[PDB]
Design a protein around this ligand. Sequence first.
Ligand SMILES: NS(=O)(=O)c1c(F)c(F)c(S(=O)(=O)CCO)c(N[C@H]2CCCc3ccccc32)c1F
Ligand SMILES: NS(=O)(=O)c1c(F)c(F)c(S(=O)(=O)CCO)c(N[C@H]2CCCc3ccccc32)c1F
Ligand SMILES: [Zn+2]
Ligand SMILES: [Zn+2]
Lengths: 260, 261
Amino acid sequence: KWTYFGPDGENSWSKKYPSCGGLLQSPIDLHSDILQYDASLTPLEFQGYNLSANKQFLLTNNGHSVKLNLPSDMHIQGLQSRYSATQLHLHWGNPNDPHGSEHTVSGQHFAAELHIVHYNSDLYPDASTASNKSEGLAVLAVLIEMGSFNPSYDKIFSHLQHVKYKGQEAFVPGFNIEELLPERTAEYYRYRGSLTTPPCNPTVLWTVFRNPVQISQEQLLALETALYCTHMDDPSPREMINNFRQVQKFDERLVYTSFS
Amino acid sequence: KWTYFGPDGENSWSKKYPSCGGLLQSPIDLHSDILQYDASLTPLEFQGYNLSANKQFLLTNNGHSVKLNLPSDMHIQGLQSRYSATQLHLHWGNPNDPHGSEHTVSGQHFAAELHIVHYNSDLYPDASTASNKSEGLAVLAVLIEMGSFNPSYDKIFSHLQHVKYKGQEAFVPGFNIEELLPERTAEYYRYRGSLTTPPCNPTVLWTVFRNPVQISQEQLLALETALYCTHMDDPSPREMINNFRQVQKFDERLVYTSFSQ
Ligand SMILES: NS(=O)(=O)c1c(F)c(F)c(S(=O)(=O)CCO)c(N[C@H]2CCCc3ccccc32)c1F
Ligand SMILES: NS(=O)(=O)c1c(F)c(F)c(S(=O)(=O)CCO)c(N[C@H]2CCCc3ccccc32)c1F
Ligand SMILES: [Zn+2]
Ligand SMILES: [Zn+2]
């Protein structure tokens, strides 16, 4: 049903998914006037991120992004509850306007953005069940800019040709997912928000790292051009591009920062 | 009953107004990747903008906005038909966040925005009719930044405290509307877009001037605290603040500029 363009684009999500028109919607612009240092924001610890290279993890194209399934022994420690990983995926723009992060910083997009989705496994049995519940989800967001080639992101990007079309899947050998995180992960923005796709439930604790990672121009172009939303046999293919939500209003609220 | 905040705010407009989820939506972020210089975009001429000071024009709060009615003898020359003025209005933020323009430039909001709405009077007998026809409307947008006191904007703002509530009306003596436009009107952005409120019709030819005008902090504060969306007797009053739509996706679309650099 829902898409990022045309008649079924983000202004019409709230028909079928009423939370998309409710409170606490993400993503948002991160800008200095709404930032406030909170010394309670200590470093997260990423446990079980070094995935067994003797295990394979499913990469899918689901017609909205590309997702990598992650094992529930992978978790974040440092939040009030343990949050266990469920999947990671990316958002991007298109080669004519290669500025497709979801969050913006001082009004500026980054080229792309990686999200590592986790759910409160102390309170809930699985990610779906947690996804509409209080304290349900925690997402780590990495902002991505063009720069150097990044061998670690290429661990995912080398498999994109096998998940070109909707419904397709590939197996990815385990690698250390912490290699996808930026420098100085102690430095981050934190706020309470929502899923950025339907059903837009306002159940996400967001952690957006302050520092971006770099990928090369070729890796960015590959991510922007490799994938389609549509099934292989669809006579009207659509490229998977511009798969980010516009920023939401965020008034009389703060975004907490772990850095001054 | 649509609003800019809460359950009836902008992500819900398309439930009742389908064009709000349609094509060609405004406003947009004006940034380099989507600009293209077009030498055919020659200067507009503003005719009959100098409204007589002995005449008076109706200022009205309709609950979603405050508009000044303008006479159909006021025209823009330069488009592919004559477009005659119908009304102007503003968009703004709030006292704790004076960043309420609709268009943004390279990701930055301006303090407020003035829209002067025109309709194709060669083709249509009124703006209402024009409003659902392709390029039936042409809106001029002036980006407003916090700066010096502006006596020309004050000719409007000094009356707003007199139209505080929905349905209220006041008369504003004529003045030269061109005093609301910025320097170097020849430099503008041009694109096909939409109304930025419901019903979000995709029928507007937008001209956004490159250069902002300034109004003062005190003018912004008065603008941001003077008006209500509700009637004088409403037991649930709602301040008219933050009355701007977020910028829209704009892909496949280009914005044409009359300036190259
Ligand atoms: N930006 S975001 O908000 O992090 C974000 C996405 F962008 C996004 F596309 C998805 S997806 O399934 O629809 C495609 C895989 O990526 C998700 N998963 C959510 C929504 C569906 C229900 C559910 C159930 C359990 C865990 C997560 C989710 C998502 F969380
Ligand atoms: N930002 S914008 O897109 O320029 C813009 C507004 F912001 C704005 F609030 C209004 S409104 O106050 O009339 C309430 C809107 O339903 C308008 N007027 C349009 C829309 C309704 C039909 C009509 C008929 C004659 C003249 C103008 C208009 C508007 F054009
Ligand atoms: Zn995401
Ligand atoms: Zn307007």
